[PDB]
Design a protein around this ligand. Structure first.
Ligand SMILES: CCCCCCCCCCCCCCCC(=O)O
Ligand SMILES: CCCCCCCCCCCCCCCC(=O)O
Ligand SMILES: CCCCCCCCCCCCCCCC(=O)O
Ligand SMILES: CCCCCCCCCCCCCCCC(=O)O
Ligand SMILES: CCCCCCCCCCCCCCCC(=O)O
Ligand SMILES: CCCCCCCCCCCCCCCC(=O)O
Length: 581
């Protein structure tokens, strides 16, 4: 490997290379139009081929970062369009690439990407599949310049498959529009997981990330020995640390080294890696990162002997505290793939707190004898919440569950924006649909994973437009204490009922012509404003108003002169409601 471009061209293949080069340029030159990028990509790609033919051909022995930066420095308009970015070109290499990284604009001033109609889309897809897809890949790459390029490429190919299938189905939109929604939401979620892992690492440090990773790796690979699990956690932590810094190639090399290491030591890690490890380099690490938990060994004893009963608990602990705590987490974790990672972490902190206390007390052995009892309420807490909220979802269906949640959280934090209360409640309810379909034992991991993105989105919005101290508390706590801080929120008894607005509770006959989605949203917005206006209102009372409201909408979406019914019956609904409440 005298030629890093040649070697990359050979590993990836022409198609993948072209796409990844496009994404890379799109992420740095975020205001250059599609056609400049296509020219760059073809220039780099002709050049690549030259080095494949002959690794000694001129400039082929240069560094990927060298060639990338030289090409950025060739763009004629660099100073006029990107100002400071052009000053990077004056640097010699190690710092030039670090300079360009710094001048990527996260969330730049760009107008929202409007979804064309299905038949406009499918026609452009048929008419010129290549430019349709790549022009859209360019549009996403340039608005998400830190999005890991191959994860973005993985998404692109699922769009290609979605268009391929649904554009030749005789009912185009009912096929395609759902798949575009799932992709849009997986995209925003995966993006938000990235941004969350990197802020947690910054705030709380390496130890806390390594704790989290021990728990997760141990659930995944319950047959690995501890020393193999800690080797992995150390390499994971180096990988995550380098990928947060956001340099594409340094992240991609670290991720490949780890995937390579895992695929070579498969029989010391998990038996479910065969297929991932037969895939090409581009896809290996991604496949492994999503692999199912291995089945745990049958012969697994109690943790009591090593962690509670053994004399030498304090001595083994004091000799390497984190190592001992990590062993405890490893042994607990691999027996419980049914626990959320953060429940495992509460348990480990409990074990830690008790050892710190007990190993300095008169009789340590007696002191930590019953440490396992302290785990019981922590375990039961999220289990019981899932029991209760999934029972509710079983009774109500998704929509009516979402409305239960609206009432619940509007009352707890009625200063929150109505649009925000509505979105997070809809979203919480979808977490019910997804997670309450699992058997009891998969439910906690499902909840943890989807709640972490609903609650980050929550805390992101609130950082920007603060509203409640209590919410800021829950948002700035450890990721281990986030969800339970939110669960501990109580009804705000300080809230002054908001003033009646007539317009707020006036409806027009165009609600009959909205989608199911749009109707629901306008009703749920009404429900929030209802609770915001009458916060002491009882569930029985609330029900009585929603039944009449529901009755009202039906009647006037059935009437000759729809709009008169809305103004006239509405006068009767509003006055009836104001009486009863
Ligand atoms: C390469 C393929 C990327 C295609 C995505 C563009 C179409 C989706 C529009 C975004 C949306 O769902 O609103
Ligand atoms: C002339 C410079 C052009 C830019 C070169 C683009 C580099 C793309 C390489 C990305 C490596 C992708 C391999 C996947 C690694 C992984 O996630 O496991
Ligand atoms: C392979 C060993 C890695 C190190 C393992 C350390 C285990 C620590 C257990 C306590 C978990 C606490 C999670 C973060 C909370 C805090 O920062 O106090
Ligand atoms: C699940 C239903 C979703 C609707 C909201 C109510 C769920 C509350 C219980 C969540 C348990 C979260 C597990 C992660 C954790 O350990 O904190
Ligand atoms: C911008 C600020 C937004 C704040 C929105 C507050 C609404 C509360 C959301 C908390 C729900 C999280 C799940 C907790 C489950 C439970 O109730 O036990
Ligand atoms: C003060 C009283 C004024 C209140 C007017 C009545 C507005 C009620 C909003 C209800 C939205 C409920 C939708 C329920 C459903 O979809 O069936």
């Amino acid at each position: 490997h005298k030629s890093e471009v040649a070697h990359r061209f050979k590993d990836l293949g022409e198609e993948n290379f072209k796409a990844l080069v496009l994404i890379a340029f799109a992420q740095y030159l975020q205001q250059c139009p599609f056609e400049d990028h296509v020219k760059l990509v073809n220039e780099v790609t002709e050049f690549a081929k030259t080095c494949v033919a002959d690794e000694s051909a001129e400039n082929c022995d240069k560094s990927l970062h060298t060639l990338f930066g030289d090409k950025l420095c060739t763009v004629a308009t660099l100073r006029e369009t990107y100002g400071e970015m052009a000053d990077c070109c004056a640097k010699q290499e190690p710092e030039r690439n670090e300079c360009f990284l710094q001048h990527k604009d996260d969330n730049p001033n760009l107008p929202r990407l409007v979804r064309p109609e299905v038949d406009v889309m499918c026609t452009a897809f048929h008419d010129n599949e290549e430019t349709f897809l790549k022009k859209y890949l360019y549009e996403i790459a340039r608005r998400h310049p830190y999005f890991y390029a191959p994860e973005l490429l993985f998404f692109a190919k699922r769009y290609k498959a979605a268009f391929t299938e649904c554009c030749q189905a005789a009912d185009k939109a009912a096929c395609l529009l759902p798949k575009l929604d799932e992709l849009r939401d997986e995209g925003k979620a995966s993006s938000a997981k990235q941004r969350l892992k990197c802020a947690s690492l910054q705030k709380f440090g390496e130890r806390a990330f390594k704790a989290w990773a021990v728990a997760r790796l141990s659930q995944r690979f319950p047959k690995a020995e501890f020393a193999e699990v800690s080797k992995l956690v150390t390499d994971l932590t180096k990988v995550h640390t380098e990928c947060c810094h956001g340099d594409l190639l340094e992240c991609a090399d670290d991720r490949a080294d780890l995937a390579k290491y895992i695929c070579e030591n498969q029989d010391s890690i998990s038996s479910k890696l065969k297929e991932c490890c037969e895939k090409p380099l581009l896809e290996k690490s991604h496949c492994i990162a999503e692999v199912e938990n291995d089945e745990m060994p049958a012969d697994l004893p109690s943790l009591a002997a090593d962690f509670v009963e053994s004399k030498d608990v304090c001595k083994n602990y004091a000799e390497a505290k984190d190592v001992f705590l990590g062993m405890f987490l490893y042994e607990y974790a691999r027996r419980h793939p049914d626990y959320s990672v953060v429940l495992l972490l509460r348990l480990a902190k409990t074990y830690e707190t008790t050892l710190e206390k007990c190993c300095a007390a008169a009789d340590p052995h007696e002191c930590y004898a019953k440490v396992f009892d302290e785990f019981k309420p922590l375990v039961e807490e999220p289990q019981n919440l899932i029991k209760q909220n999934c029972e509710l979802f079983e009774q109500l269906g998704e929509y009516k569950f979402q409305n239960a949640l609206l009432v619940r959280y509007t009352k707890k934090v009625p200063q929150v924006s109505t649009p925000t209360l509505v979105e997070v409640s809809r979203n919480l309810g979808k977490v019910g649909s997804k997670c309450c379909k699992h058997p009891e034992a998969k439910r906690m991991p499902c909840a943890e994973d989807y709640l972490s993105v609903v609650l980050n989105q929550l805390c992101v919005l609130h950082e920007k437009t603060p509203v409640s101290d209590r919410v800021t508390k829950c948002c700035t706590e450890s990721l281990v204490n986030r969800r339970p801080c939110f669960s501990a929120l109580e009804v705000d008894e300080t809230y002054v009922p908001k003033e009646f607005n007539a317009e707020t509770f006036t409806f027009h006959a165009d609600i009959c012509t909205l989608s199911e989605k749009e109707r629901q949203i306008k009703k749920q917005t009404a429900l929030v404003e209802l609770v915001k206006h009458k916060p002491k209102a009882t569930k029985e009372q609330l029900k009585a108003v929603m039944d009449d409201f529901a009755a009202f909408v039906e009647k006037c979406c059935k009437a000759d002169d729809k709009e008169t019914c809305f103004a006239e019956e509405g006068k009767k609904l509003v006055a009836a409601s104001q009486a009863a409440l």
